[PDB]
């Protein structure tokens, strides 16, 4: 939404910089020398250069899996309620998100500036905070330590609290293999390890990446949801081809940055709610069927007793919604190499 | 008849009753506004539209069903450089007729300076002409190069120094407010120098020991403040938007199918319907 | 100039045809492929607006500019003769 920072701060089509520098040296020449030294140090430390594939991810996950005093004494808690795990054993932090890196979420409740409902079936849900996650990874050639992993109510993936070597705190998207104590860096000289951020031109083919920039320096926009990932297919001097989670093959400028690995929380899809109340907490409202209404209220409505659709499926607004394409025909494909087809055709061919 | 340069030739000498009883829906195509004798619109008076402005036309079918529709002018947003005003003027709303008139006169400055009021048909153009003459009278104010709308009002003309002072003061207030908001929403947070260690989970077995923090920003308070402000300048992301100044920009219409909400006959906004919702015009 | 006859009406907008997209201009400098100095050439309005006038290679063929060029050339010739 636009209820956060104003347009003048949020909107910028062409970003003129890709390195958010924070020099320590007194002069520009010494700052440049220090930046070169830091890049050389990152290059020296970098040793891994082979692609990071699905199989290597599985091997790392297998290795990670293979590898009474701590309580509040005298504190009888609730009669029945108890946390699923104590703080020193839970996968997630179990604490509270940093106040300095978040703010209260403005809940629009599916209504636009006109006050009318534009997004249907939205409910209040549980109170939420928006947290400021660094989609840019602007700080380059500085190593950071993952201190903890955190839940995010607006996002399907997990977040990670990164403490840079100078004490700066930030939140980044966590990878499926990201654990506390991990060391991460953003640079073109970085090794090919999960969590590291590199330009798409410095990532070998077959590697798995996430948080891909459409425009250099504008922050990753593609492949963000939990468990999602994209694969590097081909590379040329100016463009790198990626296969996306939707089975879409698209080219990206070689200068667009990306992070190695799969998005954390790949088990999101396995969640079972069990009752309407869980979705109610999550922020959903009941969905009344089109054919349950009167003919004035939906094209499928009307008819004594129950009936069928009586016509090819259409939405409330009279548009075919089963097989009818909606992308603008005249809109150019641009860098899109090939866009996916229907899932039935994909699975039958 | 007379006034052959204006519309109404065959109405001029038919009688009073016909003139009062004339039915506008008789006119299918739009008539030029200057020849029709139509009042300029507020949009035209705030831009340089020359012969173009909001108009009307009638739709007639073989069944003899008539319908009148308002039609908007074809306007672009373009930037100009003015030597007489000593400033670039962003996002002036102009038309094809206006552009051709500028070509005929010899450019933007010549068009503003020389065009008669009837042909110019732009109060904004008249104000620009006034500011050009004022700058001719007082060159020292022209050397400042402030946006021309600073001196649009006569009082600002009478008190130029206060105009510049107030302009700069409001600009600085805007800058400070925006800087504070960006700092508040920045993605980088630097904790206090007496407690930089944030709460962490147990490090996974085999993770290399983290090196001690390098607090180079504690040598000097001035360095600390500069570093903190620099960190506050950071942004999470940068968004793309429709901008006619970009070669490949575009806007959006309605859905591909072309249908509407079932059973709803939406009424378009007018001056007697949703007239003042969320903004004046 | 535009013409108000048979305009294109679409999207609620009106677009007017330009039957004559040409304007005469006086060449102030040698333009390779267009002409020499002092010539009156019919060019396209866009060409005048975005290349010739901004680069100072030509100007609209108004009586003022034509007369100014003529008088300047006459003065330059008289200056040559005075120098001789």
């Amino acid at each position: 939404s636009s209820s956060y920072l104003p347009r003048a701060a949020t909107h910028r089509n062409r970003v003129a910089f890709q390195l958010f520098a924070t020099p320590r040296e007194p002069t520009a020449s010494k700052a440049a020398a220090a930046a070169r030294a830091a890049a050389e140090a990152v290059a020296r430390s970098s040793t891994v250069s082979a692609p990071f594939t699905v199989q290597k991810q599985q091997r790392l996950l297998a290795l990670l899996a293979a590898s009474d005093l701590f309580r509040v004494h005298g504190l009888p808690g609730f009669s029945g309620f108890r946390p699923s795990s104590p703080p020193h054993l839970s996968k997630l932090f179990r604490g509270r998100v940093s106040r300095h890196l978040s703010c209260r979420r403005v809940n629009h409740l599916g209504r636009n500036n006109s006050g009318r409902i534009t997004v249907r079936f939205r409910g209040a849900g549980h109170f939420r905070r928006l947290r400021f996650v660094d989609y840019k990874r602007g700080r380059k050639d500085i190593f950071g330590t993952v201190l903890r992993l955190e839940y995010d109510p607006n996002r399907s993936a997990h977040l990670a609290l990164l403490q840079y070597d100078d004490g700066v705190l930030s939140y980044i998207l966590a990878t499926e293999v990201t654990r506390p104590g991990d060391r991460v860096v953003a640079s073109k000289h970085a090794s090919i390890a999960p969590g590291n951020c590199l330009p798409l031109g410095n990532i070998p083919v077959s590697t798995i990446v996430h948080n891909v920039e459409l425009r250099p320096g504008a922050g990753g926009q593609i492949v963000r949801a939990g468990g999602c990932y994209a694969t590097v297919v081909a590379k040329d001097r100016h463009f790198v081809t990626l296969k996306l989670s939707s089975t879409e093959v698209r080219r990206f400028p070689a200068d667009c940055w990306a992070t190695v690995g799969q998005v954390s929380n790949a088990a999101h899809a396995e969640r079972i709610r069990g009752k309407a109340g869980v979705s109610y907490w999550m922020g959903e409202r009941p969905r009344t069927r089109g054919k349950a209404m009167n003919p004035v209220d939906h094209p499928h409505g009307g008819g004594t007793g129950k009936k069928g659709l009586k016509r090819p499926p259409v939405s409330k607004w009279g548009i075919l919604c089963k097989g009818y394409k909606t992308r603008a025909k005249k809109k150019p494909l641009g860098l899109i190499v090939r866009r996916k087809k229907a899932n039935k055709l994909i699975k039958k061919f | 008849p007379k006034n052959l340069n204006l519309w109404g030739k065959y109405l001029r000498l038919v009688g009073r009753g016909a003139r009062r009883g004339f039915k506008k829906w008789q006119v299918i195509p739009p008539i030029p506004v200057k020849a029709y004798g139509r009042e300029p619109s507020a949009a035209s008076q705030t831009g340089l539209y020359h012969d173009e402005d909001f108009n009307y036309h009638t739709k007639r079918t073989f069944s003899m069903r008539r319908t009148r529709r308002k039609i908007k002018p074809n306007v672009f947003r373009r930037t100009f450089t003015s030597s007489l005003l000593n400033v670039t003027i962003p996002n002036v709303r102009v038309t094809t007729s206006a552009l051709h008139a500028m070509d005929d006169m010899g450019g933007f400055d010549a068009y503003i300076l020389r065009t008669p009021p009837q042909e110019l048909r732009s109060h904004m153009g008249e104000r620009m002409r006034q500011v050009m003459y004022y700058y001719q009278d007082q060159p020292a104010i022209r050397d400042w190069g402030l946006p021309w709308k600073v001196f649009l009002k006569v009082a600002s003309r009478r008190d130029p120094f206060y105009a510049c002072y107030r302009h700069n003061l409001r600009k600085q207030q805007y800058e400070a407010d925006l800087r504070s908001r960006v700092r508040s929403f920045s993605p980088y947070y630097l904790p206090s120098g007496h407690q930089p260690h944030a709460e962490r989970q147990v490090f996974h077995e085999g993770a290399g020991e983290s090196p001690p923090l390098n607090l180079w920003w504690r040598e000097n308070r001035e360095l600390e403040e500069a570093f903190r402000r620099r960190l506050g300048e950071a942004k999470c992301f940068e968004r793309a938007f429709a901008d006619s100044s970009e070669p490949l920009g575009y806007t959006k219409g309605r859905c591909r199918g072309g249908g509407g909400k079932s059973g709803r006959s939406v009424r378009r906004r007018s001056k007697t319907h949703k007239y003042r919702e969320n903004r004046a015009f | 100039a535009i013409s108000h006859l048979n305009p294109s009406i679409s999207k609620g907008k009106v677009h007017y045809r330009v039957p004559n997209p040409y304007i005469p201009v006086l060449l102030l400098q040698a333009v390779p492929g267009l002409g020499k100095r002092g010539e009156l050439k019919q060019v396209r309005r866009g060409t005048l607006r975005l290349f010739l006038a901004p680069k100072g290679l030509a100007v609209v063929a108004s009586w003022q500019n034509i007369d100014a060029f003529y008088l300047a050339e006459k003065e330059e010739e008289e200056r040559r003769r005075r120098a001789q």
């Binding site: - | 006619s244 575009y250 591909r256 | 040409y22």
Partner: peptide, 28 residues
């Protein structure tokens, strides 16, 4: 018009791009 580009590619056969440069002096 779901897609509404600011600049529309010019057509080859339109009269606008093929109109004649006209004549400076009609009499000759």
């Amino acid at each position: 018009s779901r897609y509404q580009p600011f600049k529309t590619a010019s057509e080859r056969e339109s009269p606008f791009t093929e109109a004649e440069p006209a004549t400076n002096f009609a009499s000759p």
